[PDB]
Amino acid sequence: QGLTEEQRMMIRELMDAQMKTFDTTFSHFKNFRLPGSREEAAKWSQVRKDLCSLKVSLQLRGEDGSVWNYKPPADSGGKEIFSLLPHMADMSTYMFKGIISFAKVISYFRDLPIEDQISLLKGAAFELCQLRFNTVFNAETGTWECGRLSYCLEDTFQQLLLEPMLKFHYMLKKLQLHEEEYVLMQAISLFSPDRPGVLQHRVVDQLQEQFAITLKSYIECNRPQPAHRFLFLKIMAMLTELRSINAQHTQRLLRIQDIHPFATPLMQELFGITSLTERHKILHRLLQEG
Numbered sequence: 001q002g003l004t005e006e007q008r009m010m011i012r013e014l015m016d017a018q019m020k021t022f023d024t025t026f027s028h029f030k031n032f033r034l035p036g037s038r039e040e041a042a043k044w045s046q047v048r049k050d051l052c053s054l055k056v057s058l059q060l061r062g063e064d065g066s067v068w069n070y071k072p073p074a075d076s077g078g079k080e081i082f083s084l085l086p087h088m089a090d091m092s093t094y095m096f097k098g099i100i101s102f103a104k105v106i107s108y109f110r111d112l113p114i115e116d117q118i119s120l121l122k123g124a125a126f127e128l129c130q131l132r133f134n135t136v137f138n139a140e141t142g143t144w145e146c147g148r149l150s151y152c153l154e155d156t157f158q159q160l161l162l163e164p165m166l167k168f169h170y171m172l173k174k175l176q177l178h179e180e181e182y183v184l185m186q187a188i189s190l191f192s193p194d195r196p197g198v199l200q201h202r203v204v205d206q207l208q209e210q211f212a213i214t215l216k217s218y219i220e221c222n223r224p225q226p227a228h229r230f231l232f233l234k235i236m237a238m239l240t241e242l243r244s245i246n247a248q249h250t251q252r253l254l255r256i257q258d259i260h261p262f263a264t265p266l267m268q269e270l271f272g273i274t275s276l277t278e279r280h281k282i283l284h285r286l287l288q289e290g
């Protein structure tokens, strides 16, 4: 090990939260939906760009051994480019509920004021959701293996690595991180002091730095040097790149939502779709429960 006692216990708590709130087999993801003027033309034309490189087919395995596969329609210029968004809204909403439950287990997060707990969740939800997706992603077949469900990227590796979120998943997977390293990335992402609407900048910054040092010292003392000499800094680089991709994808959601509303109420709150506690009643209730 080689970490202080505060540090070994800090990981213990994160790992615990991860264990209690991450459904790696997706056993409990049920009841989800499946497919069955000049100003506005530029809006639709930008949504096509927003959606075209994020297309997956869907595989769904049945208890009996049957397989249902779904290939999405090719872009014919109409509403058909939205066929998977209701299913994704349910998958992402299921994921965020787990992220919220993740944060509340953590003493340092729980000790923060409700309004700051909200702001931290609004800024980190996509990021922590995508870090969790990374651990079920298979880079050899381009597939997120989510228990009975599978999402495969449709062939069209050099054109894929153009979309920043897809390059991220490949780069991150290549690093071969430990469970403990993934969960530490989550904390560092969660306790970001310069999220919109955070009040206790000083406190959150102190907590983040405390988590980064634990990740830095975890790597020093659990990896053969100087092979992984810069793994910590690589991870920090990808956290920063992940903060940027979050913003881009949040703006994508809003453009799509503008012309084809589909976001769940929890998503509406998380991403600013229309008092910080009074404008986020679902989050507040989700945070005030046990």
Ligand SMILES: CCOP(=O)(OCC)C(=Cc1cc(C(C)(C)C)c(O)c(C(C)(C)C)c1)P(=O)(OCC)OCC
Pocket (backbone or CB within 6 Å): 054, 056, 085, 088, 089, 090, 091, 092, 126, 129, 133, 144, 151, 165, 166, 249, 250, 252, 253, 256, 271
């Ligand atoms: C705020 C961001 O929205 P969002 O959370 O939820 C939308 C319903 C988000 C969800 C998402 C993104 C990806 C990419 C980007 C890695 C391809 C996925 O592979 C997956 C699955 C479920 C297939 C694992 C889900 P979006 O980035 O990608 C849609 C595939 O949606 C933004 C428009």
